[PDB]
Amino acid sequence: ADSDINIKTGTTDIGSNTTVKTGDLVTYDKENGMHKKVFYSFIDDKNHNKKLLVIRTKGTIAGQYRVYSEEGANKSGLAWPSAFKVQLQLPDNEVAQISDYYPRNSIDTKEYMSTLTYGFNGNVTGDDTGKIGGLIGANVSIGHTLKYVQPDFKTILESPTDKKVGWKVIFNNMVNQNWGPYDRDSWNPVYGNQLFMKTRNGSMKAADNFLDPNKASSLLSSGFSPDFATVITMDRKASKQQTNIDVIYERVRDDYQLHWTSTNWKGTNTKDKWTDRSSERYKIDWEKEEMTN
Amino acid sequence: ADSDINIKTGTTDIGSNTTVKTGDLVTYDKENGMHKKVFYSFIDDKNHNKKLLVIRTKGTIAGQYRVYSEEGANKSGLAWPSAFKVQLQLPDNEVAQISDYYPRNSIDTKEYMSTLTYGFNGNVTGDDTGKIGGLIGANVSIGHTLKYVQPDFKTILESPTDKKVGWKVIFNNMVNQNWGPYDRDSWNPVYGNQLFMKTRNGSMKAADNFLDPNKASSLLSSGFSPDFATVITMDRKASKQQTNIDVIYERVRDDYQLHWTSTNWKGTNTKDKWTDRSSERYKIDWEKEEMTN
Amino acid sequence: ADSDINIKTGTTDIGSNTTVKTGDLVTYDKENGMHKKVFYSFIDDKNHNKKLLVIRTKGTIAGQYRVYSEEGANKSGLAWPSAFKVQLQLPDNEVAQISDYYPRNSIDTKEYMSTLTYGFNGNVTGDDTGKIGGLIGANVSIGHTLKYVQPDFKTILESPTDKKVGWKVIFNNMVNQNWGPYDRDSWNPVYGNQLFMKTRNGSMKAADNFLDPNKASSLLSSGFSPDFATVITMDRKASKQQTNIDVIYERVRDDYQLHWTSTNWKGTNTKDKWTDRSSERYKIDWEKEEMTN
Amino acid sequence: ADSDINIKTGTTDIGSNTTVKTGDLVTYDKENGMHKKVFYSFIDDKNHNKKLLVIRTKGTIAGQYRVYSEEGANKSGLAWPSAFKVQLQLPDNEVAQISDYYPRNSIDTKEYMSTLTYGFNGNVTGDDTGKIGGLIGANVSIGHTLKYVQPDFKTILESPTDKKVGWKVIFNNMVNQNWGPYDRDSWNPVYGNQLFMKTRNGSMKAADNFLDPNKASSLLSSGFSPDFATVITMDRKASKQQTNIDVIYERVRDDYQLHWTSTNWKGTNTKDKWTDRSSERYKIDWEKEEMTN
Amino acid sequence: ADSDINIKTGTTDIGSNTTVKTGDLVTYDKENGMHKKVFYSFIDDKNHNKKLLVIRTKGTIAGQYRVYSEEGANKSGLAWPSAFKVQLQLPDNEVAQISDYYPRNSIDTKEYMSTLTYGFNGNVTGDDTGKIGGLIGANVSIGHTLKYVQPDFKTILESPTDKKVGWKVIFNNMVNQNWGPYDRDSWNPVYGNQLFMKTRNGSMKAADNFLDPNKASSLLSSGFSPDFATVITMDRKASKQQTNIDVIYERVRDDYQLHWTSTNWKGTNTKDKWTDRSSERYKIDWEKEEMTN
Amino acid sequence: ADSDINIKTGTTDIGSNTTVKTGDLVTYDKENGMHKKVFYSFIDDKNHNKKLLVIRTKGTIAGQYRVYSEEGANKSGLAWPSAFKVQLQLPDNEVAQISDYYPRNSIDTKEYMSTLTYGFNGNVTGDDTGKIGGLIGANVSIGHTLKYVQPDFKTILESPTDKKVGWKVIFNNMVNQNWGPYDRDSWNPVYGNQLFMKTRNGSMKAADNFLDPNKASSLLSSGFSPDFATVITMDRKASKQQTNIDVIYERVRDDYQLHWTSTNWKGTNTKDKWTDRSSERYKIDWEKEEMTN
């Protein structure tokens, strides 16, 4: 921070004594169930060697936890969103560049603890028949413990460039009714993948044996609300003072199926079965400090 | 945040140098027991490309934990609120759009820890008759521990669009007299669903074997006080500067019954039996910056 | 909050550039031992569609943990406060309405923990007689841990309306000399309810066998000091700029009885035996911005 | 708080744009070892309906943990402060009233933890004689855990009125050399009350078996420094603008004795043996905003 | 605080609109190894009824953990600082008084938690010989645990008067090489007091068996750096505006003795063996607002 | 900090009353997949003896975790980034020097806890035949647990000079599918290094037995974003006010090999196989206060 290098806090930041022009661009893609809202801010700091544009991609991408298929009373399919993606892309012929972005990748941590314990014990015995026993034992013990946190979903910043940037919220793993946690690769030889299995040998039909959405992660059904920030820099003396930028909201759905084997239920999950891509193009006008679609 | 992208804190926020006009609209629906209060704020920032209207839905929806059917000393009914919902909706013919909202869906986490232990022990034995003995053992053990937090009720942002948004507070589970927790799908083959039974084999009237409301979550009896924020954008060049918006407060109640099977009590819970819904129509006037109903 | 919807912090709040009129009204009710102080503030924000009055009810209601009765050396009664209530009430003919209130009901939480363990062990025995033995064991375990917080008293907001609002602080449970916790419903077939029993056996008389007030919750004897906020809105165009409002402090006392069974002490608690109600009327003058009584 | 009711923070507070006149009044009572300092502040806010006077009682009441008696080599006495009190009261004929106070009584909490465990274990035995054995067990466990904090001393607000207010800091319990904790009622069949005995069997003089004040709570020896706040309101049109107020500092000491029983030491404690009281009178002048003694 | 009593934060505080005079007085006592620095500030608030002088006693008193006596490989001594003190003292004839001080005595706390578990188990037995066994067990266990923090040194405010105040930081206990802790009273029949013993049976010179100063509390060797605050009040009408004040830094050292018993070492600590005092007199000139020594 | 030495906070900081000139320099090295952004700020404080240039190296270095070689169906390589580095170098002939830098090296800590527990127990036996037994045991136990936090990657400030400074983020260890953690040196004789081995013994191609990048640290695949800051000073009277500075981004990749031994997979990792260097030169002009590349 500034104070760590003996500099007055805030001295190095941009935006002082500048008139900032903001805007809201709202769009709903009905077929894909994506409410897309772009909040941009033009920052022209006369003391900065560049012209800045801050784009915050907000809104909500519907999860759509739906039972899509039903092949009789002993087979049914459940489509669930396994990844949510947001991307901004500048045509390679533009002179604008992607300067900064947030959030970024964080370094994980884990808590480790060792334990060494040893003791002794002596027991004296006897009975009514004047018997006398004895016992002198010992023991040693070595232990290891590993603690770490497991989020249900992961927020990952995909390797960016000066002309593209993107994030993807992916499924990590979930707890099913206090047991697990199960992930996309969990496999039990008798029941297979029990990710969204309600009961292991219930008597109802396949369509009625899936975990209730209210008891799973809210992102599966309700959807995920992004909050990402991208900063675009443009040179003040560039001939072309107009830029086009593409914003893509994307959802990747897997296919989880239950089939009844006449003894118990057996799950199966197939990765990256469907992709819902919703793209839109906006025009950046650096001279007027306005953005439109 | 702005600090993370080397921008002065608060540079990109809206509302600076703007005269904000606020107001309160209070209404009580006697029949449904819903005290509704709408607090709005017109924000017209000449540096923002659109006009803003922030609507905060406040108040409280009575829980109404009640013993409704006192059908003797062997059976009785209890009606409890299993979900509370607040929904705003713009007519599809409106030009205004829903720009932002709060709270949204957060990502759940879970703490995981693995234990690996192994030790050894020796024992020397004997007695008065000169007998001697020995014992040399070993052991290994593998532990897993999963820890996470479970609220009694969930706050869920339902998939929004540019024309409607809503939230729902649903019953997750509850602890009943130091044991549990139980939920709407709990089932014990002997007693059934013990969610709201006071005593397992208590010789009183069915109307008297229900958990004391002071011992259950306060939201069941007293009611739930929403605090939601939704901001509506509007183009300054729109043809019609008046908008209509509907606000719905509704409560869904389940049906829990105690019947005595001549040894003990048996509990049964029926989902989403009743629905209480209070709807209102409000008029937004963007030119005068005032809202009425 | 405001920063979450990209709005400048504090933009939507009321009170900016307004002259606020405050006051104190103090009263002591000697019969019911209630010191009542009402602190109001008149907020007339020209940018608000209504006029505001913020009423804070403060002070303290004495507990009066008392040995009221003594029927000989074998039976004695203890009166303790089981609930403290504060209520504000507007006549239904009034045009003013109750807008907001604090504190409200909060969602409780619990912490769940699951543990799965399984190890192995082998032992090799022997003695001086050239004997040889063995042991190959296995084991599995499944643990469930539930953790949650239990306040001694609960603060509850009772379902409000546009003419009435109230709170109640009810007794939840208490720890008696490191045992328990016990509540109003605790029962033991030998000793009965041991809420305030000092000793299970004693040559002392009944009056000397009750828990020392310094060893119990300070609210039982010293008293409870409320701190509540009620906001009352009034329409500027209303014909009557005078409003009456009733403020009611109230204490409900139970009856805990001890009696000697010639072997041990027996305790019983009778719910809601007495009710100390202290009501007072204040007059609000919206034109001069002052309350009186 | 004010932000919870959509009100600009600090709008409803008193004191803005007011000239505050303060003062220090210091007095030492040598006989009781009490250093008394009274810090007052006159706040005349023309937007408040009454005058305000804020009195903070400070200083230090010496503990005086001492060995007062010495019965040669077998009995001895130790006088320790079991309670410290600070009280302010106006004559019942005064027109001023006590408006507010701090600190008030807080609600205690406790942490609960329920554990349910069940597991299985199998054993296979054998020896050199071709013997074979078996073992198949099952177990269950039901745990409870209660956790709460126990301060060495309690700060209690006595039931206040419009003419009297006071606080008392009482001895709750104490840990003696990593054992206990003991309180004023701890009793051991052979040793009695071990509150302040150094050694249970140690052969010394009675005057040398008491715990060293550096090892007990610092409030016993060094003394307790109060910090309390009281607010007195006065009507601007009251006939007489002078008020008298009495401030009392108290210390109540118990009597702990050790006697030798020819095997060990036997401790005994007698509650509230001695009371040290220091009363002082101050004059309040509301016209000049001045206080004297 | 002020916000607790509905008063604007900071309204009551002293020092508003006043010119403050500050100063430093640095002195080193070579004999006693005490670097003494006094930092005073003169505050004359025209809205305060008396003048103020804030004296901060700073600097550091060298520990001087040194092995002084060397009597051959059999015996040796170690002088260590067992207490550090700082005192301010006004001559009795002065009219100025001591008004406030910091830090003060605080109330210690502890964590108490009771546990109650009970389980059942059954074991079936058998062998090749058609033998059958059985076992039905039960158990119960009540636990108690106590948790509290122990600092190496205690900061104690000695009972103040209006003419003198003082503090003292005393040795509480210390952990020696991962085991202990040990205080000045710790005694073992074999080794005695192992406070500063490096090894139980090392065959080195007694001067070489003492704990390495880097493995002990840094205050023993490096020294203790006080930071105390004392505020002196003075009447504006006082006849004499000149005051004398004494500032005393003193260190008390104990005597730890190690001698060889031909099998192991023996520890012996003699309380309060030595005492170093460094007194200095300063002059306070209330008219010029300056202090000198 | 300043408050610790009785100095007004921020008094000794740089930047007050200065016009700061900032800039952004963005570059993308496509071959090495490095998005490099340099954010500089010129601070010319007239009260500072030298000029300042605060360089912040930001951007993202792609991880590029991928299967570089599939040597049939039982031999495959995986190239993963073991260390990421950032360097700034001033040519030896420059008069400017490196003044400060952040982050720096911090001292690690660990929690240590020594347990000592002992007990006693007695058991009385019997049977139907009149047989009587006895048992009296004693035990003792000495424990030591160590606990510390260890991140997946460690960020290290390399020994800097007045002409160059650098940082390196090195792989510490990682948990593989709830077990481990493994590092570059982990070695199991049966399976070798299991760092990125998906299954200990499956039946698939070696290219299909590597840990899924979504289950590994995000830095391995997505990349690492430096947030490193460097301060450069320059004399105002220096002969020439131009300076060249080199900025280097690096990525060192190890080589992980899987080979099938017809019983199980065997992993092996060879440290620092490859090095990716991306260097760039910038020109610093202290007169215009601008930086170019």
Verify F-B touch: 3 or more CB pairs within 8 A: yes
Tell me how far apart the alpha carbons of residues C7 and B53 are, in angstroms, rounded to a whole number.
11
Torsional sign, CA E54, E59, E63, E64:
negative
Backbone angles phi, psi at F85, to 5 degrees: -135, 150
Tell me how far apart the alpha carbons of residues E26 and A177 are, in angstroms, rounded to a whole number.
69
| Contact between residue E22 and residue E39 where contact means Cβ atoms under 8 Å apart | yes
Tell me how far apart the alpha carbons of residues F258 and F256 are, in angstroms, rounded to a whole number.
7
| Contact between residue A93 and residue A119 where contact means Cβ atoms under 8 Å apart | no
Q: How close does chain F come to E73, measured CA to CA in Å? A: 33
Tell me how far apart the alpha carbons of residues C83 and C105 are, in angstroms, rounded to a whole number.
17
Contacting residues for A192 by C-beta, under 8 A, at least 6 apart = A266, A267, A268
Contacts A178 to C, Cβ<8 Å: 112, 114, 144
Judged by DSSP in three states, A237 sits in: coil
Considering only residues 56 to 95 of chain B, which have any Cβ-Cβ distance to chain C shorter than 8 Å?
56, 58-60, 62-63
Contact D109 C149 (CB under 8 A): yes
Backbone angles phi, psi at C248, to 5 degrees: -130, 115
Query: Chain F residue closest to A169 (CA)?
Result: F214
C–E interface: beta-carbon pairs under 8 A:
6
Which residues in chain F precede a discontinuity of more than 2.5 Å between C and N?
A: none
Chain D contact for C147, CB < 8 A? yes
| Contact between residue C199 and residue C179 where contact means Cβ atoms under 8 Å apart | no
Neighboring chains of F (3 or more beta-carbon pairs < 8 A): A, B, E
Long-range contacts of E122-129 (CB under 8 A, 24+ apart): E122/D137, E122/D138, E122/D139, E123/D135, E123/D136, E123/D137, E123/D138, E124/D135, E124/D136, E124/D137, E125/D133, E125/D134, E125/D135, E126/D133, E126/D134, E127/D125, E127/D131, E127/D132, E127/D133, E127/D134, E128/D131, E128/D132, E128/D133
- For chain E, the straight-line distance linking the first and the last C-alpha, in angstroms and rounded, comes to 38
Other Cβ atoms less than 10 A from the Cβ of C128: the count is 11
Residue D279 parent element (H or E)? strand D265-285
Tell me how far apart the alpha carbons of residues D71 and D209 are, in angstroms, rounded to a whole number.
13
Contacts C22 to D, Cβ<8 Å: 12, 14, 45, 47-49
Judged by DSSP in three states, D16 sits in: coil
Tell me how far apart the alpha carbons of residues C280 and C88 are, in angstroms, rounded to a whole number.
10
- The domains of chain B, with CATH numbers, are 1-293 (2.70.240.10)
Contact A178 C6 (CB under 8 A): no
Backbone angles phi, psi at E134, to 5 degrees: -155, 160
Chain D contact for E149, CB < 8 A? no
Q: Which two tokens stand for residue F106?
A: 């911090």
Which residue of E7, E109, E121, E184 to mutate against D (max D Cβ within 10 Å)? Answer: E7
Concatenated DSSP letters for B133-158?
EEEEEEEEEEEEEEEEEEESEEEEEE
Contacts D114 to B, Cβ<8 Å: 178-179
Contact D138 E125 (CB under 8 A): no
Which residue of A16, A112, A158 to mutate against F (max F Cβ within 10 Å)? Answer: A112
Q: Which two tokens stand for residue A15?
A: 């935006």
Contacting residues for C106 by C-beta, under 8 A, at least 6 apart = B218
Give exposure, E131-148, as e/b (b: 16+ Cβ within 10 Å): eeeeeeeeeeeeeeeeee
Which residue of D108, D218, D283, D288 to mutate against E (max E Cβ within 10 Å)? Answer: D218
Tell me how far apart the alpha carbons of residues F210 and F267 are, in angstroms, rounded to a whole number.
10
Query: Chain D residue closest to C64 (CA)?
Result: D159
Concatenated DSSP letters for chain B?
-GGGGTB-TTTT-B-TT---EEEEEEEEETTTTEEEEEEEEEE--TTBSSEEEEEEEEEEE----EEEE--SSSEEEEEEEEEEEEEEE--TT-S-EEEEEES-PPPPEEEEEEEEEEEEEEEEEEETTS-EEEEEEEEEEEEEEEEEEEESEEEEEE---SSEEEEEEEE--EEETTEEEE-TT--BTTTB--TTBS-TT--S-GGG-BPPGGGS-HHHHT-B---EEEEEEE-TT-S--EEEEEEEEEEEEEEEEEEE-SSSEEEEEEEEEEEEEEEEEEEEETTTTEEE-
Q: How close does chain C come to E201, measured CA to CA in Å? A: 38
Q: How close does chain F come to B116, measured CA to CA in Å? A: 10
Chain B contact for F142, CB < 8 A? no
Other Cβ atoms less than 10 A from the Cβ of D53: the count is 22
| Contact between residue E233 and residue E243 where contact means Cβ atoms under 8 Å apart | no
Tell me how far apart the alpha carbons of residues C211 and C225 are, in angstroms, rounded to a whole number.
23
Contact B12 C4 (CB under 8 A): no
**Distance (Å) of CA E164 to CA D66, E86, E158, E275:** 21, 11, 10, 20
Q: How close does chain A come to F77, measured CA to CA in Å? A: 22
Quote the radius of gyration of chain C (alpha carbons, Å): 29
Q: If 0-12 CB within 10 Å is exposed, 13-18 middle and 19+ buried, where does residue E99 land?
A: buried
Query: Chain F residue closest to B115 (CA)?
Result: F179
Considering only residues 169 to 208 of chain E, which have any Cβ-Cβ distance to chain C shorter than 8 Å?
none
Considering only residues 250 to 279 of chain C, which have any Cβ-Cβ distance to chain D shorter than 8 Å?
none
Tell me how far apart the alpha carbons of residues B156 and A215 are, in angstroms, rounded to a whole number.
12
Residue at token pair 């050292």:
E253
Neighboring chains of E (3 or more beta-carbon pairs < 8 A): C, D, F
Chain C contact for E139, CB < 8 A? no
Tell me how far apart the alpha carbons of residues E106 and E156 are, in angstroms, rounded to a whole number.
9
Concatenated DSSP letters for E146-195?
EE----SEEEEEE---SSEEEEEEEE--EEETTEEEE-TT--BTTTB--T
| Contact between residue A222 and residue B158 where contact means Cβ atoms under 8 Å apart | yes
Contacts C179 to E, Cβ<8 Å: 114
C-alpha C95 chain-centroid distance: 32
Quote the radius of gyration of chain B (alpha carbons, Å): 29
Q: Which two tokens stand for residue D291?
A: 């206080």
Resolution in Å, one decimal place: 2.8
Contacts A137 to C, Cβ<8 Å: none
Query: Chain C residue closest to E6 (CA)?
Result: C39
Contact A105 F35 (CB under 8 A): no
Long-range contacts of D154-158 (CB under 8 A, 24+ apart): D154/C214, D154/C218, D155/D103, D155/E107, D156/C218, D156/C222, D156/D105, D157/C60, D157/C218, D157/C222, D157/C223, D157/C225, D157/D101, D157/D103, D157/D104, D157/D105, D158/C222, D158/D87
Concatenated DSSP letters for B250-286?
EEEEEEEEEEE-SSSEEEEEEEEEEEEEEEEEEEEET
Residue D89's nearest CA partner among D230, D204, D227, D224 is: D230
Nearest to F114 among E39, E56, E178 (CB): E178
Q: Give the bridge partners for D291, in sequence order.
A: D284
Contact D6 B56 (CB under 8 A): yes
Residue at token pair 């809210």:
A218
Q: If 0-12 CB within 10 Å is exposed, 13-18 middle and 19+ buried, where does residue E88 land?
A: buried
Tell me how far apart the alpha carbons of residues E151 and E173 are, in angstroms, rounded to a whole number.
8
| Contact between residue D153 and residue D184 where contact means Cβ atoms under 8 Å apart | no
Q: Which amino acid is at E118?
A: Y
Contacts B178 to D, Cβ<8 Å: 112, 114, 144
| Contact between residue E8 and residue D13 where contact means Cβ atoms under 8 Å apart | yes
Chain A contact for F213, CB < 8 A? no
Q: Give the bridge partners for E7, in sequence order.
A: D14
Quote the radius of gyration of chain E (alpha carbons, Å): 29
Contact B133 C118 (CB under 8 A): no
Contact C144 D115 (CB under 8 A): yes
Kindly state the DSSP code that residue D249 receives in the 8-state scheme: E
Contact D6 B39 (CB under 8 A): yes
Q: How close does chain D come to E11, measured CA to CA in Å? A: 6
Kindly state the DSSP code that residue A192 receives in the 8-state scheme: B
C-alpha E24 chain-centroid distance: 25
Backbone angles phi, psi at D2, to 5 degrees: -65, -35
Contacting residues for C72 by C-beta, under 8 A, at least 6 apart = C206
Residue at token pair 């032992």:
C123
| Contact between residue A147 and residue B112 where contact means Cβ atoms under 8 Å apart | yes
Kindly state the DSSP code that residue A47 receives in the 8-state scheme: T
Chain A contact for F132, CB < 8 A? yes
Verify C-F touch: 3 or more CB pairs within 8 A: no
**Distance (Å) of CA D238 to CA C146, D96, D242:** 60, 9, 10
Tell me how far apart the alpha carbons of residues D155 and C222 are, in angstroms, rounded to a whole number.
11
| Contact between residue C68 and residue C79 where contact means Cβ atoms under 8 Å apart | yes
Residue E188's nearest CA partner among E67, E284, E269, E253 is: E269
C-alpha F280 chain-centroid distance: 23
Nearest to D114 among B39, B56, B178 (CB): B178
| Beta strands A111-127; A97-102: pairing state | unpaired
Number of C-alpha atoms within 13 angstroms, CB side, residue D275? 9
| Contact between residue B73 and residue B246 where contact means Cβ atoms under 8 Å apart | no
Chain C contact for B43, CB < 8 A? yes
Query: Chain C residue closest to E112 (CA)?
Result: C178
Q: How close does chain A come to C154, measured CA to CA in Å? A: 29
Query: Chain E residue closest to C39 (CA)?
Result: E6
| Contact between residue A216 and residue A196 where contact means Cβ atoms under 8 Å apart | yes
Backbone angles phi, psi at B194, to 5 degrees: -90, 25
Contact F218 A105 (CB under 8 A): yes
Chain F contact for A44, CB < 8 A? no
Q: Which two tokens stand for residue C53?
A: 């009055």
